Design a binder for this molecule. Sequence first.
Ligand SMILES: Nc1ncnc2c1ncn2[C@@H]1O[C@H](CSCC[C@H](N)C(=O)O)[C@@H](O)[C@H]1O
Ligand SMILES: [Cl-]
Ligand SMILES: [Cl-]
Ligand SMILES: [Cl-]
Ligand SMILES: [Cl-]
Ligand SMILES: [Zn+2]
Ligand SMILES: [Zn+2]
Lengths: 299, 124
Amino acid sequence: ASSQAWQPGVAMPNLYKMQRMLLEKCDLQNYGDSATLPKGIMMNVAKYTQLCQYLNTLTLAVPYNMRVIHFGAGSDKGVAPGTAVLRQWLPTGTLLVDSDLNDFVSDADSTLIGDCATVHTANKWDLIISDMYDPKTKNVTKENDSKEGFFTYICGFIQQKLALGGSVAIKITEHSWNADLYKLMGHFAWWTAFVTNVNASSSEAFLIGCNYLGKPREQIDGYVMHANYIFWRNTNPIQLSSYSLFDMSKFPLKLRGTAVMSLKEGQINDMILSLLSKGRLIIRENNRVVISSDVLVNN
Amino acid sequence: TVLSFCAFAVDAAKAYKDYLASGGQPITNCVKMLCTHTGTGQAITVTPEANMDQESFGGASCCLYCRCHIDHPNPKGFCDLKGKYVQIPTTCANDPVGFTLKNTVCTVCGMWKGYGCSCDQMLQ
RNA sequence: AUU
Ligand SMILES: Nc1ncnc2c1ncn2[C@@H]1O[C@H](CSCC[C@H](N)C(=O)O)[C@@H](O)[C@H]1O
Ligand SMILES: [Cl-]
Ligand SMILES: [Cl-]
Ligand SMILES: [Cl-]
Ligand SMILES: [Cl-]
Ligand SMILES: [Zn+2]
Ligand SMILES: [Zn+2]
């Protein structure tokens, strides 16, 4: 649609989620084309700006003293452009932790260097962003199979460390995906695959889970849902567009002061699930936030 | 006797000025932010505050000490840029690291001295 | 994936 170019990106229409498509090659007519970016703006500043502009239209829970963790925050240039955008977007005072396999310097309150599998925390989080991508994914050796690696960690991290009512944005591509992550999208009140307009020439998308319910509201077959995602990308051509980057007046996340309360799985009734589904409640304690990265000691 | 260690002070700030004086390439990949350019124009802020004569950058990416992974000389070794946004005059946005090293912020108005601070300055 |  000509109207897509005026938005920060495009969300996968709901009718695609209800189909049963066969997996096929992802073939984009503009594959690899470069976006025209504003002067001196890095690709990931533009990309995270469009992701945050889209998250502004969803029912994100935004408590005071919000907790956000960003995985895959490092870059080959040693800086964290995505983290700088998240810090600009999130309310002042939001606790922001970022992590990456490789060393980098960032604006996060704390940074952990090492495989995400070495990251530990007993705390619950309000928002999880992952931009992780395994470089070996570029070497296609075994067909387009569901991938493990960091995806097994992020599935476990969502099921153990995401506050009920919390949300996630997990980066996937044609070959970088996991069937269990798609199944986990059914544990949210709502989910979608979002493509930024500055990267419309890539099979990249963010799987967005909005308002975690901690239980499956819809059973999703991950193998079929990835095939439906590729069918959408193959049939809905999205043109590169940097238009939304030029109006930043309404960029910061709105401070909703979402209620935070402590409840046991036994008190999570239908009235509470209704509040969680509307972005009006976060369930977790408000204990101090403690994180650690396991260090392997070799002689 | 940690004075023998400190006495030998490794001045990275002065070394960077000499490197630039020798026709050296300024540090790159400072993270420039998208913003309205209708901000206060203060030097270091919790959010981008660039006016029409400035560019806003992620602070950590414009700190020589953060980028070179060397101790901060600031009191208690804390960084004044990390976790904040630094406004750099557009005319110097090609070398944000050198700009933050060679310039200082006014404690009264929060503006850069010589690039926004008008405290040293009638008809009402 | 880090245009
Ligand atoms: N197992 C793993 N654990 C942690 N980080 C990983 C990982 N596998 C890949 N990554 C990281 O995923 C990143 C993909 S590129 C990320 C770019 C970054 N978001 C930016 O703002 O520029 C790389 O930095 C890579 O090191
Ligand atoms: Cl091109
Ligand atoms: Cl670390
Ligand atoms: Cl794998
Ligand atoms: Cl409570
Ligand atoms: Zn620093
Ligand atoms: Zn002043």
